[PDB]
Write a protein that binds this ligand. Sequence first.
Ligand SMILES: Nc1nc2c(ncn2[C@@H]2O[C@H](COP(=O)(O)OP(=O)(O)OP(=O)(O)O)[C@@H](O)[C@H]2O)c(=O)[nH]1
Ligand SMILES: Nc1nc2c(ncn2[C@@H]2O[C@H](COP(=O)(O)OP(=O)(O)O)[C@@H](O)[C@H]2O)c(=O)[nH]1
Ligand SMILES: [Mg+2]
Lengths: 430, 432, 154
Amino acid sequence: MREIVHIQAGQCGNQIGAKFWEVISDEHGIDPTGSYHGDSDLQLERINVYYNEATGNKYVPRAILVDLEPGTMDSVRSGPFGQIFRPDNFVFGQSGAGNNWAKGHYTEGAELVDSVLDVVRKESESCDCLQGFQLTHSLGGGTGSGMGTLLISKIREEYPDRIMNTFSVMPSPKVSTVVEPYNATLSVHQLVENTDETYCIDNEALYDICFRTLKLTTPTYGDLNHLVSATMSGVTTCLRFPGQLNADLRKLAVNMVPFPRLHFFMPGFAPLTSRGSQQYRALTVPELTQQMFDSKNMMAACDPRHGRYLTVAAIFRGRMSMKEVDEQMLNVQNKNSSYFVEWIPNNVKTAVCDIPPRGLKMSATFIGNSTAIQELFKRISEQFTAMFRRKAFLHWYTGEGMDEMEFTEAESNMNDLVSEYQQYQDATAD
Amino acid sequence: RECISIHVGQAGVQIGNACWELYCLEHGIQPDGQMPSDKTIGGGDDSFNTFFSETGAGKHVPRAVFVDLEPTVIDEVRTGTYRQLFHPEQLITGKEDAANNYARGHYTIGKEIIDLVLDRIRKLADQCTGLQGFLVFHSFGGGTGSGFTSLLMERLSVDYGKKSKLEFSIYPAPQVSTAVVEPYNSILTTHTTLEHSDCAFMVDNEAIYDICRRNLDIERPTYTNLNRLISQIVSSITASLRFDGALNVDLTEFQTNLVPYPRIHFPLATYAPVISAEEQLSVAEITNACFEPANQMVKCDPRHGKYMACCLLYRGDVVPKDVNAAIATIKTKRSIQFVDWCPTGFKVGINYQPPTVVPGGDLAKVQRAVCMLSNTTAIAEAWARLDHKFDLMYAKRAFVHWYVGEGMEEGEFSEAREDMAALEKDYEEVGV
Amino acid sequence: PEKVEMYIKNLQDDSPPVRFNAAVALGKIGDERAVEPLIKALKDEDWQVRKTAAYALGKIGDERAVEPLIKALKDEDRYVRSRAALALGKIGDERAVEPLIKALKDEDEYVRLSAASALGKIGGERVRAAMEKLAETGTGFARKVAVNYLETHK
Ligand SMILES: Nc1nc2c(ncn2[C@@H]2O[C@H](COP(=O)(O)OP(=O)(O)OP(=O)(O)O)[C@@H](O)[C@H]2O)c(=O)[nH]1
Ligand SMILES: Nc1nc2c(ncn2[C@@H]2O[C@H](COP(=O)(O)OP(=O)(O)O)[C@@H](O)[C@H]2O)c(=O)[nH]1
Ligand SMILES: [Mg+2]
């Protein structure tokens, strides 16, 4: 369990994926040419997780950049850290998926998928001991949704003993494309069956944090991705720096996933700021710990107080008292006892990393498996029902090879998932 | 990049030459096909080549085909003012007509001519770099309009799969009514064409007769009077496809925007201003008039239904701010009920080319005009009228023996009515 | 002559269909006085005014229009880009050869075609040289247009 293979699909996948590399490359002390120009020994300790060592002492990301739209190829390559990526690892079509899931999962996507698998096989070969896979994509579009979930299924039949982890960004009417609930319902059906750990990044919550908390009147995707990049930086901290707590993908999955299907995590970050917001008043351990479960700091549009936490992983970053952290994590559980499942002893795990993120003296990242995530799936189900009830625009999908049963199967699975969440929220130790 | 127009039977053929008269006038084309520097429209960029091929001479020829099982109606095209415009192979005629019998136009007599027609379309399709599809004109009530159109629609689906087929249908009226059995022919064509058409624009002969009497003051309107009006509305619908405009450019943009459920593809078109040449209307006035049942192509009450789509196509002296202001009042002031799952969005198109009227026609030249396309549940009222008339005669099996004796099975009547029942239920259920 | 002054002041007018009708008129008549006002209408707020000013500038032919039309191949509107490309083809100035070659890699089919047609209408020696280089070091549609031009020209 050493190397992680990263795959980024579609518009959303490549944009949020690129910001992740720009962020962790700075954290690991890598410039856009792949040369290490840092100071800490800790920076290169677990560098082999996300990078390959080539040339002299040059580091290359173990990243595969996919899209059916070739436009994305130039966007990322001409970008800030576009020169670190392997040129043979860009797999781009000339076609496009026109926001149709069936186009990415059956027609246009199924043609390019084997050329992608050729590249995944290439990177899996120069892997001493592969941990697993990490996919960044959007569930609202066509490529990231359809092709991305085809990739997930195709990888899982070839590499089943490897962990499949995803960063799935949820579509929202606030942000965006009428058949987004179809693309999101059809992808959630694949994720419930083919991933081990999924981070539910909701565009509704992303907009709301910018709008309500950050006071950004009409935010761009650059403002939303500023929350996504900082979240991804914190949730992958455990894997990137030397430690004991959730050191690898499987160890994290073992602690966070009590039930096969209940593997969708409500991500969170503290403190929250706007891009280039001239920093003022550094946070303390109690202020960090309080912003923990604070609904206003969640990246998924759910209230934690509307459900119970099955399991929790908390990551504190910077120079701070371990006794302060341990004291504040115990109070947050005793002063919120009812919101933590009684039948799962020691469900909250804490980790402290001495390395803080870029621009922040101290930060705190939170990964929660709360039964309250059913609120997100209910919202997609309602949006889906209204359209599928009348069988509206169904022919755009069914025309591209798909069957109506596939819509009924995805709807059944997503309704079942919500009922499962509720069954454990209502479950007592007695 | 290209569209083929098929004109079937008396109604379709007669409407076709009224359409083509207006298209020529709109794009600055003479009845011989010549487009000289004095008569050329002027303002560069022209996309009329979707409907007119260009000969080596500089002659613009309609990408049109005219079919009738009797020669009478097409003979008038061949001797008319536009005798020069169309090529002889485009105009196809039989000897014996379908005698207002669907089974003659679909089976017996229709089967004789179907193959030639297809090769004549093939001659046109072979002159297209990227054929988008077909525009089919026909009546519901004539044996050829009903029977041959459904037979051709069936064959075009096999011979041209991924090609759009948009219809312009002559819905019957008791006023201009040459047959008792028109309800039978109407239900039969709609049943067999439903799975083959992508979109269908009905023209209710009763509505145009009512519009001519009310708006144009014609005492007893003739086919000449109705047709000049039909072609005005039709031109406004097809303008998107012939001009360098942003809304409903190709046949796919038309389907995508207007039809969300496949079976429910009958948009109701309205048109304002319809003035007699005997006083200037603003953008607010003409937009408002689109939401008035009096100005509709088909008789129905939109206040009793739900919308799935709503497009406003303006032409002439129409300013962007005025259109936005007019739309804004219609959103806040009117009781326009849309279905839940679809957004309350009015797709707007503006072409600044002045309206072109028929010289010697009953219509006055206006500064601005508007053609609204609404996909409403209210169009089930048009189906209900027809279905009831059908049921009255069918229960006693009247006139049915004429159909069964012309290569048809009586069960096709029951099968047809069953499809109409389902179509009526679909409009009802979709509008909850 | 007496009416040319009128439409030049209608090109300035508040009303967008009036501005459109002024640009249609000045292309239909085509006077050297209308060059600079139609050059200003290439930067109009409305696409229907910009595209018809571009068509007018190509018909009239005046060399002063070559520069604003080169910038018009980069217009956000697909119809404006196609009309500007075709106008440059009508004028036939060799300064347009390279911007028209860059338009061969446009997202719109009509624009790509209009750029190909324009290049063929100019057909000097600099066009030929650029076609020779593009036929060997070129890709897809842009390569087909170089290869088709050199085969239509023995
Ligand atoms: N508005 C309009 N309706 C017409 C016209 N000609 C016929 N109709 C109507 O169409 C129906 C009759 O069908 P037709 O088109 O004449 O018949 P056909 O397709 O030639 O078929 P056969 O009569 O069997 O040869 C009636 O409702 C007529 O009133 C016309 O030029 N315009
Ligand atoms: N937060 C975020 N959401 C995005 C981004 N790009 C697109 N989206 C969302 O993803 C959905 C559209 O999917 P997209 O990636 O563009 O399409 P694809 O290339 O076909 O997968 C919508 O819900 C958009 O709001 C991005 O950069 N950030
Ligand atoms: Mg007849």
